[PDB]
Each structure stands twice: as C-alpha cells, then as structure tokens.
C-alpha cells in the first residue's frame, strides 16, 4: 500500500511505478 | 544502458527531514522479457 512511498502517478514518469520493499534494509 | 535499474524510492515526506536509507525500490524500465541488461556504472571504477 502507498505508505508515503512511490510516485504520484506513473504517467509522466516513463516507468511502470512498480514499488517493491527492499529486502536488504531490515535492521 | 543506464536505466534498467531499481530506483530507490523512500518516503518523500520524511526524506526531506533526514537520510532515510534505501527502504524501497521503484522499477526503472519495464517490458515483457526480463531485462537484466547491465549498466556501465558496474564497468567504470569509481574515483576513490
């Protein structure tokens, strides 16, 4: 869910806007 | 290529305040087939 992260839209971004959580950052 | 790269997206409301660290990744360039196309930052040895 859009928890403050990601894009306002994927329209002008030229990406898909796909956000995935960093498995590296945990502790 | 330099843009088949997961872009670090991390909480723009709190990213202006402090250095959040890389907590999430935004996708850089999409397409059916899986890219994996290397980027030349891995091929250019850094200045330090």
């Amino acid at each position: 869910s859009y928890n403050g992260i990601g894009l306002k839209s994927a329209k002008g971004s030229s990406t898909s806007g796909h956000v995935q959580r960093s498995l590296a950052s945990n502790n | 290529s330099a843009s088949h790269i997961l872009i670090p997206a991390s909480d723009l409301s709190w990213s202006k305040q402090t250095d959040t660290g890389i907590t999430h990744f935004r996708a850089g360039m999409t397409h059916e087939d899986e890219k994996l196309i290397p980027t030349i930052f891995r091929y250019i040895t850094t200045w330090e």
Partner: protein
C-alpha cells in the same frame, strides 16, 4: 515325550517372541516389528498375539502407545482377517465387563483402542455408535468424550446423519440439564473442538494404503455374545544412469548471479535482487563464491561488494555461515592460485567485514603465522587485511579487539621463540609494530 517337549518350547518361544515385539512397538519401528512378527507363526499363536496386544494396551503404562498398537492390528487384519476378527471380539467384551465393573480407568484404555481401530478401518461404525448409546444412556460422560474427540472426525464423514443425532442429544445435556462442574467444562470443550473441526484428533500411523489394507471392516455389534476364545492361549498338543561430467546446471545459475550483479547500480539494489531469488541453502555457499570471483574481475576493490555482503549477513544467519565458511575456504585453499593484484582486493574485502563486526574476530583464529603453515602469498593476504583494520578502526581500537580475540595463533605469547622472532619480524615489515610490544617482553625473558 519329546514331541510334547518340542511343541512346548515352540509354544514358549512364540510366546517369548511376541511379548518383546509388542513391548518394542513404537512409531518408525512398526514395519520392522511387523516383519519379525510375520516370520513367527502368528496363526498357531493366534490368541498369544491377541492377548499380548490386550495386556500391553490395558496395563495403564500405555495409552500413549495405542495408535502404535492399533496400526499393527490393521497390518495383521490386512494380512490375516482372523487375527483382527478375534481381537475385535475381546475388546468388545473387555469394554462390557469393565463398564459393568465401572472400572473407568480400564474402559478408556479399551475405548481409545476401539477408536483408532475405527480410524484404521478395522471395525465398523456400528460397533462404535452402540457403545456411545450405552454410555450416553447413563452419564458416563468422561469416557464418551475421549471417544468422540478421536473418532468423531472419521465418524461424521461416514455416518453423518446418526452422528448428528448423537450430538443433538449430547447438546441437550449441557443446555437443559444440570451437570457436575468438572465434567461440564470437558463436555463444552468437545463443542469447542467441533468448531475447530477435529484437527487435533486426526493424527496417527496411516501406514497402509486404503487398498493395501484388505478391507475386513468387521461388522460385529456389542450386543452379540462373542465366543470369548481364551482357550487358544492355553497350551495344547498338535497331532497336526548417465554420469554428469559437466556442470551446465551450475553454469546457467552462475550466469544468473553474475547478470544480477552487473545490472544493479548500488549495493543495496544488488542485495535486494539476490534475496528476491530465494536461493536454496545448498547454493548459498556457491553464491558467495560468485560474488568474490566477480570482485576479482573488477581489478580494484569496491565498496559495492562490501555493502552487498553486509546486507546478506544481516538478512539471515545461513548467509553469515556462508561467509564464514568461504573465508576459511579462501585462506586455506584459494591463496595458492591468486595473484598479488587479487590479494589486495580480498584483504581489503575481508578487512572491511571484520572491522565492522560482520565477521567476528574469532574467524581470524584460523590464520596461523609460522614458517611452515604460511604461504608467501598468504603473508601478502595478511598484510592487506591488517591495513584495512588499521585504516578503519585506528591503531588503538585494533589493539583492543586483538586483545579480546585471544587468537594467539596470530600473535603467540609463549611457545617457540623462533615464531615470536618470526611474528615481530613480520608485523614490523607491514608497518604496524605497536601491537608487538607484548612479544618483545616475552622474547627477552627467553634469552
């Protein structure tokens, strides 16, 4: 008479074979116990094998071993129906006797046996329900709960319509009638297990397939006089491949980790892509080897492979073991192949992880500084390791960690002044000699 003699110790040994087999019967021994039981003449010791099951059931030490026991009976009933035919008879009479005796301890021992036999399709649902009707005709409610907790899973599958009627009368008990207290909370616990769907009464030793058990579902009822065949347990007198020389599965995997490692910008990105793959634990030693070999193609140390490896270690402990195994596998084996341009990359690589406690200082205890157990490229690797320890920590903080390491293997402190003369000679050649103040005091006392 020698024939009466020979038949008696034959009868004795068959009795003395079955009794330790039943006493050694447990899970993951059932097939081995049934194998040795099969070679002993079961049909001659027909009541011997039945009575040794009944008494080992009844003894009240068991009750735990009942699903191990009833699984053997299904194996016997699959092999010889007459054994399970007679053994189901005695358990019916053992119930009706002790129900008339009001021996509540011995009844539940039989009822747990009759439950799991119905779970293993030894006996019909008719023999179960009529016991339930007799128990529910009186109170008898402590006995009937231990039945329906175990068998009601299977029984609602088979005979749902009558079993719903058992519940409906049993629900009329704790709803419109006054009950004793301690018995009452057990009865409503059965109603609690009902909504939890009997998932804690449905585990046992289903060794036989439903077509490997020859289906002798014995349709005996507990209102039948059951012949009580104790007499056969007495003694009587019979006048009667392409070999894989190539590793192309590994090569396609070794290509995939390398493509992950070169398609990423930052070390946190490459770490995320490797953890996204969910690499199996046998390969996680080999993934570290791909990372280290790709770090040596770079021709200069990079902080990319450091922060790659740091996010591996803090993710799960099996990665941290993989780096600890690799650091031993690098130092003891791989040093002989590496050039001196590659050793300065590794010593700065492992010196970075050690100085930030991703690897403990106790991994340095493996490294030993002698004339014999020291390779000339191994001493180069120690030199570029300690320089990254000095540059990161400082010369004083490194002095504190080496004192807490008690890795005399590195700096001795006693034993073979020729090694103490060796180790001072080597450390001052690096340029760090402030650590060697402990050895010079030890050296002059030997002189």
């Amino acid at each position: 008479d020698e024939d009466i003699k020979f038949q008696r110790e034959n009868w004795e040994m068959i009795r003395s074979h079955v009794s330790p087999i039943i006493s050694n019967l447990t899970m993951d021994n059932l097939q081995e116990s049934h194998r040795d039981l099969f070679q002993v003449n079961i049909l001659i010791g027909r009541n011997i094998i039945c009575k040794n099951v009944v008494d080992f059931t009844l003894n009240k030490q068991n009750g735990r071993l009942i699903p191990a026991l009833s699984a053997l009976i299904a194996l016997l009933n699959s092999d010889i129906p007459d054994i399970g035919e007679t053994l189901a008879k005695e358990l019916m009479l053992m119930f009706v006797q002790q129900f008339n005796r009001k021996d509540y301890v011995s009844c539940g021992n039989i009822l747990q046996c009759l439950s799991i036999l119905f779970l293993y399709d030894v006996i019909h649902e008719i023999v179960i329900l009529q016991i339930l009707l007799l128990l529910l005709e009186k109170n008898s409610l402590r006995l009937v709960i231990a039945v329906m907790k175990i068998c009601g899973w299977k029984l609602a599958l088979v005979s749902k319509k009558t079993h719903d009627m058992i519940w409906e009368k049993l629900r009329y008990i704790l709803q419109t009638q006054e009950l004793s207290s301690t018995l009452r909370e057990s009865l409503e616990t059965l109603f609690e297990i009902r909504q939890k769907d009997y998932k804690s009464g449905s585990q046992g030793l289903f060794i036989l397939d439903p077509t490997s058990y020859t289906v002798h579902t014995h349709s005996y009822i507990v209102s039948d006089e059951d012949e009580a065949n104790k007499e056969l347990g007495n003694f009587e007198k019979c006048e009667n491949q392409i070999y894989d020389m190539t590793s192309t599965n590994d090569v396609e995997f070794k290509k995939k980790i390398y493509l992950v490692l070169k398609s990423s910008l930052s070390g946190d990105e490459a770490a995320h892509k490797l953890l996204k793959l969910k690499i199996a634990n046998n390969l996680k030693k080999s993934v570290v080897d791909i990372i280290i070999k790709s770090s040596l193609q770079e021709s200069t140390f990079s902080k990319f492979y450091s922060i790659l490896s740091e996010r591996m270690i803090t993710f799960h402990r099996s990665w941290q073991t993989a780096y600890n195994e690799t650091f031993e596998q690098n130092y003891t084996q791989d040093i002989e192949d590496y050039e001196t341009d590659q050793l300065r990359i590794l010593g700065k690589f492992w010196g970075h992880l050690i100085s930030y406690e991703f690897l403990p200082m106790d991994c340095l205890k493996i490294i030993k500084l002698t004339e014999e157990e020291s390779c000339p490229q191994g001493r180069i690797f120690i030199k570029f390791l300690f320089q990254e320890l000095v540059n990161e920590l400082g010369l004083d903080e490194l002095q504190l960690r080496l004192n807490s390491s008690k890795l005399d293997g590195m700096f001795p402190l006693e034993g073979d002044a020729e090694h103490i003369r060796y180790s001072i000679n080597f450390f001052t050649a690096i340029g760090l000699g402030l650590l060697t103040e402990d050895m010079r005091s030890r050296l002059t006392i030997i002189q």
